Design brief:
The structure is cut from a larger assembly and holds four copies of chain A.
Chain A lengths: L34 E4 L14 E8 L10 H5 L7 E6 L3 E8 L18 H16 L5 E5 L21 E7 L14 H4 L7 E2 L2 H23 L15 H8 L29 H11 L21 H23 L7
Parallel strand pairs in A: 6-7
Antiparallel strand pairs in A: 1-2, 2-4, 3-4, 5-6
């Protein structure tokens, strides 16, 4: 249903510039329809090309940028997938993945892994942390997909996946004014610029903590052989009820009852138990996904003050302590931070 | 439901002295270093369209024909679904382009050059390729006393294919499988079947688009043959205007109002040709039902005589027009 | 969210040879007993508008002026929010009404009678009452060589009130408390404050609406002074047309295209008068902010000299027009 | 937000042709905002005029008919309210009620009455039954307000109230073709007619049973001193869960557990226990309110066949037996039927 602004708003049938694949399915992603995997009929003289794994992912076209370029690709760098390219078909969109796993390499979806092989787990955390490192401090991001990043992973690699996210370039005009929203060529800048917002300290902290929670949710998903309900961004779903069901950390009320979760291998204990109120505020920050443009309601949210300011600062510092102990738990380094 | 996040400020000042009557035409000039008055002579028009006109490659469709660009710049930029073709311009001191809309242009030579530009623009369209306009039954543009600058056009491309007996001779590499070996192995471009008769339909279509554009240019009144709306019916418009006096098969455009001196009968195309033209045009509503109009104009629904003589009448109009402006008949 | 139930079949055939270019004008004739050819001479036009134009009494606003109806029938009927003014017509055998749109009318007398009809139609509007058009800067209608038939107009009425020292003399019964004793005791009509200066604004408004209508009638081209859209700005249109030669305070309508013989300068109203007219008109977007434009045209924002001389120039245009068509200056 | 179809779809501010009463409240209808009551400052020389009760009710404008005339008024006849008239203000609408209760008459809202004074109760049932009698057999109606009719009632009268309903004129073209959808004057009929539908036996039975259930729900509300949840037409609300909570009639599974309800005076017993599946099908029929035009989904619904046809017929006949015993319970007469 598309119309023009002339004296007759004509109904336009959404044109289909690409045969939509009828056999839509990915065995690595059985629960996902938009996820489709497939192995091409490579030149059969060469057994090597047999390994080439190809996965297309479906998604809306809004996720493309002003340049018609999909947002996660901006954060992509030194990618591991053998190749990638975008696919625009009307509102729908597709994103095919060329991969060539080595003679024995075998990827698999991060979801529901449970995997306790901290070597592979650390491979994935390195991939995701380096990827999100491409984010700028005054640039921020939300993930309308879920509260984590999808990916697959083999013993040799951890291939990232396309994400339903939205870039948002905030701008903190430092009092000492000595990347700008008006980066076009001067003529074009005369008309318009990025749909920027007002950056500030609190927004920086909010986005940083948000990406950190994304990291931790992905880590959970990796070490959860059961459902990791944290991903769920359902409108009806509320974190209040979520932690009411899950309860709080037995070892300390402050944190969540993540000690009792179901783990593919060794349970780590109350290690996976983050403070609760920080998670709550994180979910509130995440709710931004539905109205990204209205930034005043979510930009500083994780770092906002509910004295209330003292409690917010203290509990954010508690979450920072949690990140410190987490990094120590995996021998990590905050140079990415 | 999700908010369609906007990655840029939507330009509110929808002001185009070239095209005020529209809701998407905005022209505006730079305010750069004035030591160079020519830099001030620069002009900058952005038009707001819909992203649906972006192909698989994320390419605005009419840009497939932006070849030998006489204008300065043409770049695409979008605010979510909204899209924006942004134009750089720089005429010489006395050169100033103007809207084709009801231009009333009397200068024969200016019309000649403009029509040459439009015909060459549309020429590169492939034989099995078919174009459909989505805003008006005439290509839109501007024109200065010296040169002409095409304007962005909202249209959809489509590729066709046939299986002629001699399916080998000539360049057959142009196929709707325009991906790279694995990616084509995954999916192929949307495509249809092309055959000579729909090609004649398309020829008639493009030529009458050219005719509509020239009418608009030389008209000191509106061009009723330029509206692609629904309630508009070629039947009612014909009833309004009627058969042309010296040739009733034609239409009474002789009485119309041109800024240039009225040539009279010269601008009077046939009747059933325009009928089938309009019915072919109303296809655009749902191109996916392509066959419902793929062949419409030249269909044999005897009727063989009727449609072939209709083609004869159309090509008679084509040749007499071309001669009327010195155009070679071989410019098709 | 509830479905806006439709109590009638929505008439799909939006066909009006009188007004094809619009999306709501449908005309059509009866197919009744043909033994009476005059019954066939009957014509039947329904226009589709929005129910918002129905008052408290559920009365279509412009119908307040459907007095001494020269047309046959005018009834209202709605399909939920959609509304439908349905017209009966029956000209004499050779009488046939036509669209005011770009009528190019040369016949002076026909124009005279049409303008008489329009002025009398608008005359009954009360002094403290103010009208606002919602579709165009000109009253819409049709006209036969003999008579004229107004067409439905989408406009909002509003009543005003003042507290002059002599708040007793004359007929003061007309108040915005137009309910019956208890029902008025419950609620009152929406109302505003009327004062002489906004009344002058309204006089200028209505008169320039009349001027736009006459231009449309005698124009063999469109009437750019008839569009109430947003991006349209009187500033840009003025820049396009410019100061009239024999009187630069006026506008260069002399060069415009009339189906009747161009009178030239005769149709050239002042400049700032049209400016303030347009700014007054753009009020209609949100009438509830009434004061933001209630006084606009005749505001004293010295400026006393400026606005009073603007009124003088406007009334000069009014009188010279009236004399140009024999109209008495007392027909205001 | 209103636009025209010309080359510029202009945003139009909804014009306000009437001061909306700021003190919006009815003491007889404390839970209803659209309900407002008020006593006018009558000529104080006459104590008689003091009794005059005036109640305006707010509602959407869609409820008006093609003639801009509100639907319940069509069913109104020999009305008891001292006077009535409609009030169009933009989309909003109002409906003022003039009443002159006699020197001692005292009206009151039917809701939450509990009243056991079968004399007054029978007054109300007579009012409602005679009112709904104005419905034609081939004409049908739905009540988007709720699953009943609002009203007030004094010892002397039972004043009806405006309803958010929608008239629907079906048409059963009897094979022996010897009120028509095309009732306009011939010219106008040449363009259009009523938005009719295809009547039939089953639709007649469905509408009849629907109005009967409306009667019974109103009677319940009258004899319920507590909430009568049956009125509720909430989208989230399902009759399945409703009767799951309420359970079925202890005296017979067939019916509903209406024996246990809360009654202003004497409980009547399992008398108020209707068959359940009939109520279910009634609620499904009622769901039509949201898309009245699409009649194929609801018109025959109460009388439709789920053998399944045998069960539907049998259980509808059981509901008819329930109406028979109900009428006997109040000495009524089916001449209205």
């Amino acid at each position: 249903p598309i119309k023009l602004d002339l004296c007759a708003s004509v109904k336009l049938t959404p044109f289909k510039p690409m045969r939509p694949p009828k056999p839509m399915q990915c065995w690595i992603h059985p629960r996902r329809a938009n996820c489709k995997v497939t192995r091409p009929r490579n030149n059969y003289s060469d057994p090597d090309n047999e390994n080439d794994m190809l996965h297309m992912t479906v998604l809306n076209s809004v996720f493309l940028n002003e340049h018609a370029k999909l947002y996660y690709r901006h954060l992509l760098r030194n990618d591991q997938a053998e190749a990638r390219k975008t696919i625009l078909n009307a509102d729908s969109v597709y994103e095919c993945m060329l991969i060539r796993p080595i003679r024995t390499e075998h990827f698999r979806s991060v979801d529901e892994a449970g995997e306790h092989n901290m070597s592979v787990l650390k491979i994935i955390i390195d991939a995701v942390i380096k990827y999100i490192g491409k984010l700028a401090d005054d640039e921020y991001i939300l993930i309308a997909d879920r509260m984590y990043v999808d990916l697959i992973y083999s013993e040799f690699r951890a291939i990232i996946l396309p994400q339903s996210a939205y870039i948002i370039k905030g701008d903190y005009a430092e009092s000492d004014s000595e990347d700008v929203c008006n980066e076009l060529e001067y003529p074009w800048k005369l008309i318009t610029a990025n749909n920027c917002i007002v950056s500030t300290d609190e927004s920086r902290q909010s986005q940083y903590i948000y990406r950190t929670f994304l990291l931790y949710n992905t880590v959970l998903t990796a070490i959860l052989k059961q459902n990791n309900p944290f991903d769920v961004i359902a409108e009806n779903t509320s974190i209040s009820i979520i932690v009411r069901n899950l309860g709080s950390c037995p070892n300390n009320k402050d944190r969540v009852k993540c000690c009792d979760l179901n783990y593919g291998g060794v349970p780590p204990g109350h290690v996976m138990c983050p403070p609760r109120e920080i998670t709550k505020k994180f979910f509130h920050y995440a709710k931004w996904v539905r109205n990204p443009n209205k930034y005043k309601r979510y930009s500083e949210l994780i770092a906002r003050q509910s004295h209330a300011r003292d409690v917010s600062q203290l509990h954010l510092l508690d979450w920072e302590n949690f990140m410190g102990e987490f990094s120590s738990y995996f021998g990590l380094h905050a140079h990415n931070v």
